Amino acid sequence: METFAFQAEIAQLMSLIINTFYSNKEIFLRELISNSSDALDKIRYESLTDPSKLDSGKELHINLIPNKQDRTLTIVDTGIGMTKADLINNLGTIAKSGTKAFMEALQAGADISMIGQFGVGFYSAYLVAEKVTVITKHNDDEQYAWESSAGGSFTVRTDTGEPMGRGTKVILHLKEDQTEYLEERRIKEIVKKHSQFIGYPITLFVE
Ligand SMILES: O=C(N[C@@H]1c2ccccc2-c2c(-c3nc4cc(F)ccc4[nH]3)cccc21)c1ccnc2[nH]ccc12
């Protein structure tokens, strides 16, 4: 396990998301499903030129997995996934410029719900989660685990868990007062409101 420091801008954004009073927290799911859909578009598009891109799995889908025992909501996709270089470097560049643009817009009067327009909608996970674990597998790299509870750092290690084939798992370790996002009726309601026309099958698992 390797530990990395967030740049000051992204650390400030994570603190704003955690500390700001903002009741419309449900938008985190729209943001994560949108990132999953974008990752699925990306591998689908690459496969149009190189069909072997799907040797790591033909199914293009999104699964929503609640676990009341662990207090986790997991979003699974069979999209493009992220390499080690994506997790540490490439996405750090995106997070930096996206945060700057979002913070400027927020000071001007934009709302937290508009976070996705800045390419940093992933960080809306911290509206409901005290810790986020990302398990990911990209065709060009090994399976990795990225994780952060904010506090200014994140970790990256090769993941020894169940081999995914290709894609991303976003594990949301929910805050104690955010357990409504583990309830079937609540997740169904949110998906219907914000994500009813996503071009991939979204399966809401139950317990
Ligand atoms: O949401 C994704 N990736 C997000 C993302 C987005 C924007 C900025 C940063 C990050 C990010 C990061 C990340 N943020 C960083 C911020 C830094 F300061 C330095 C390195 C960083 N790495 C780590 C894991 C996952 C993601 C993502 C990508 C592909 N397939 C996916 N399926 C579901 C989500 C998902």
PDB file of C-alpha atoms in Angstrom, residues 45-131:
ATOM      1  CA  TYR A  45     -16.324   2.899 -28.636  1.00  0.00           C
ATOM      2  CA  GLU A  46     -12.789   1.374 -28.505  1.00  0.00           C
ATOM      3  CA  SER A  47     -14.318  -2.118 -29.210  1.00  0.00           C
ATOM      4  CA  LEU A  48     -15.841  -0.783 -32.472  1.00  0.00           C
ATOM      5  CA  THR A  49     -12.249  -0.548 -33.849  1.00  0.00           C
ATOM      6  CA  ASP A  50     -10.671  -3.431 -31.867  1.00  0.00           C
ATOM      7  CA  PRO A  51     -13.226  -6.160 -30.866  1.00  0.00           C
ATOM      8  CA  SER A  52     -10.555  -7.877 -28.695  1.00  0.00           C
ATOM      9  CA  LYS A  53     -11.038  -4.921 -26.223  1.00  0.00           C
ATOM     10  CA  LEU A  54     -14.056  -6.978 -24.946  1.00  0.00           C
ATOM     11  CA  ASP A  55     -12.040 -10.250 -24.426  1.00  0.00           C
ATOM     12  CA  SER A  56     -12.014  -9.142 -20.737  1.00  0.00           C
ATOM     13  CA  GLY A  57     -15.863  -9.227 -20.780  1.00  0.00           C
ATOM     14  CA  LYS A  58     -18.621  -8.585 -23.355  1.00  0.00           C
ATOM     15  CA  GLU A  59     -21.359  -7.479 -20.898  1.00  0.00           C
ATOM     16  CA  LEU A  60     -21.788  -3.679 -20.615  1.00  0.00           C
ATOM     17  CA  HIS A  61     -23.737  -3.014 -17.420  1.00  0.00           C
ATOM     18  CA  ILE A  62     -24.170  -1.162 -14.118  1.00  0.00           C
ATOM     19  CA  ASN A  63     -25.035  -2.948 -10.813  1.00  0.00           C
ATOM     20  CA  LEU A  64     -26.159  -1.159  -7.629  1.00  0.00           C
ATOM     21  CA  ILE A  65     -25.349  -3.307  -4.587  1.00  0.00           C
ATOM     22  CA  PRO A  66     -26.496  -2.341  -1.074  1.00  0.00           C
ATOM     23  CA  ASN A  67     -25.134  -4.148   2.001  1.00  0.00           C
ATOM     24  CA  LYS A  68     -26.825  -3.210   5.322  1.00  0.00           C
ATOM     25  CA  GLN A  69     -24.388  -5.365   7.395  1.00  0.00           C
ATOM     26  CA  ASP A  70     -21.281  -3.556   6.029  1.00  0.00           C
ATOM     27  CA  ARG A  71     -23.178  -0.247   5.647  1.00  0.00           C
ATOM     28  CA  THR A  72     -21.977   0.050   2.041  1.00  0.00           C
ATOM     29  CA  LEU A  73     -23.505   0.976  -1.307  1.00  0.00           C
ATOM     30  CA  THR A  74     -21.398  -0.420  -4.196  1.00  0.00           C
ATOM     31  CA  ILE A  75     -21.756   0.771  -7.860  1.00  0.00           C
ATOM     32  CA  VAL A  76     -20.240  -1.755 -10.275  1.00  0.00           C
ATOM     33  CA  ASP A  77     -19.649  -1.174 -13.972  1.00  0.00           C
ATOM     34  CA  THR A  78     -17.906  -3.169 -16.707  1.00  0.00           C
ATOM     35  CA  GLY A  79     -16.621   0.097 -18.292  1.00  0.00           C
ATOM     36  CA  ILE A  80     -13.052   0.963 -19.402  1.00  0.00           C
ATOM     37  CA  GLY A  81     -11.653   0.960 -15.827  1.00  0.00           C
ATOM     38  CA  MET A  82      -8.604   2.945 -14.647  1.00  0.00           C
ATOM     39  CA  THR A  83      -4.892   2.125 -14.864  1.00  0.00           C
ATOM     40  CA  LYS A  84      -2.425   2.873 -11.976  1.00  0.00           C
ATOM     41  CA  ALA A  85      -1.289   6.001 -13.953  1.00  0.00           C
ATOM     42  CA  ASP A  86      -4.960   7.090 -14.191  1.00  0.00           C
ATOM     43  CA  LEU A  87      -5.467   6.687 -10.388  1.00  0.00           C
ATOM     44  CA  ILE A  88      -2.318   8.553  -9.337  1.00  0.00           C
ATOM     45  CA  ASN A  89      -1.451  10.971 -12.147  1.00  0.00           C
ATOM     46  CA  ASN A  90      -4.040  11.458 -14.954  1.00  0.00           C
ATOM     47  CA  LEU A  91      -7.071  11.809 -12.668  1.00  0.00           C
ATOM     48  CA  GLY A  92      -5.079  14.092 -10.350  1.00  0.00           C
ATOM     49  CA  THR A  93      -4.687  16.506 -13.326  1.00  0.00           C
ATOM     50  CA  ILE A  94      -8.471  16.312 -14.047  1.00  0.00           C
ATOM     51  CA  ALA A  95      -9.326  16.770 -10.325  1.00  0.00           C
ATOM     52  CA  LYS A  96      -7.084  19.895 -10.101  1.00  0.00           C
ATOM     53  CA  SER A  97      -8.543  21.866 -13.072  1.00  0.00           C
ATOM     54  CA  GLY A  98     -12.078  20.628 -12.348  1.00  0.00           C
ATOM     55  CA  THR A  99     -11.870  21.726  -8.676  1.00  0.00           C
ATOM     56  CA  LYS A 100     -10.563  25.220  -9.639  1.00  0.00           C
ATOM     57  CA  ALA A 101     -13.457  25.704 -12.146  1.00  0.00           C
ATOM     58  CA  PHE A 102     -16.052  24.345  -9.662  1.00  0.00           C
ATOM     59  CA  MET A 103     -14.770  26.499  -6.710  1.00  0.00           C
ATOM     60  CA  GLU A 104     -14.861  29.642  -8.949  1.00  0.00           C
ATOM     61  CA  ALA A 105     -18.455  28.805 -10.042  1.00  0.00           C
ATOM     62  CA  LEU A 106     -19.485  28.100  -6.375  1.00  0.00           C
ATOM     63  CA  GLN A 107     -18.181  31.515  -5.179  1.00  0.00           C
ATOM     64  CA  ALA A 108     -20.139  33.074  -8.127  1.00  0.00           C
ATOM     65  CA  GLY A 109     -23.347  31.368  -6.912  1.00  0.00           C
ATOM     66  CA  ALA A 110     -23.460  27.899  -8.585  1.00  0.00           C
ATOM     67  CA  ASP A 111     -24.910  24.993  -6.571  1.00  0.00           C
ATOM     68  CA  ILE A 112     -23.144  21.830  -5.260  1.00  0.00           C
ATOM     69  CA  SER A 113     -25.579  19.790  -7.523  1.00  0.00           C
ATOM     70  CA  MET A 114     -23.714  21.213 -10.605  1.00  0.00           C
ATOM     71  CA  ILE A 115     -20.429  19.417  -9.580  1.00  0.00           C
ATOM     72  CA  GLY A 116     -20.603  16.970 -12.548  1.00  0.00           C
ATOM     73  CA  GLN A 117     -20.371  19.833 -15.083  1.00  0.00           C
ATOM     74  CA  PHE A 118     -16.801  20.264 -13.800  1.00  0.00           C
ATOM     75  CA  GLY A 119     -15.685  16.632 -14.271  1.00  0.00           C
ATOM     76  CA  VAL A 120     -15.324  16.128 -10.484  1.00  0.00           C
ATOM     77  CA  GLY A 121     -18.793  14.623  -9.813  1.00  0.00           C
ATOM     78  CA  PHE A 122     -16.964  11.529  -8.428  1.00  0.00           C
ATOM     79  CA  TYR A 123     -16.242  13.612  -5.271  1.00  0.00           C
ATOM     80  CA  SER A 124     -20.012  14.037  -4.608  1.00  0.00           C
ATOM     81  CA  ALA A 125     -19.600  10.484  -3.097  1.00  0.00           C
ATOM     82  CA  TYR A 126     -18.379  12.337   0.067  1.00  0.00           C
ATOM     83  CA  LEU A 127     -21.891  13.852   0.536  1.00  0.00           C
ATOM     84  CA  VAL A 128     -22.949  10.394   1.794  1.00  0.00           C
ATOM     85  CA  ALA A 129     -19.709   8.373   2.368  1.00  0.00           C
ATOM     86  CA  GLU A 130     -17.075   8.674   5.133  1.00  0.00           C
ATOM     87  CA  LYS A 131     -14.739   6.492   3.003  1.00  0.00           C
TER      88      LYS A 131
END
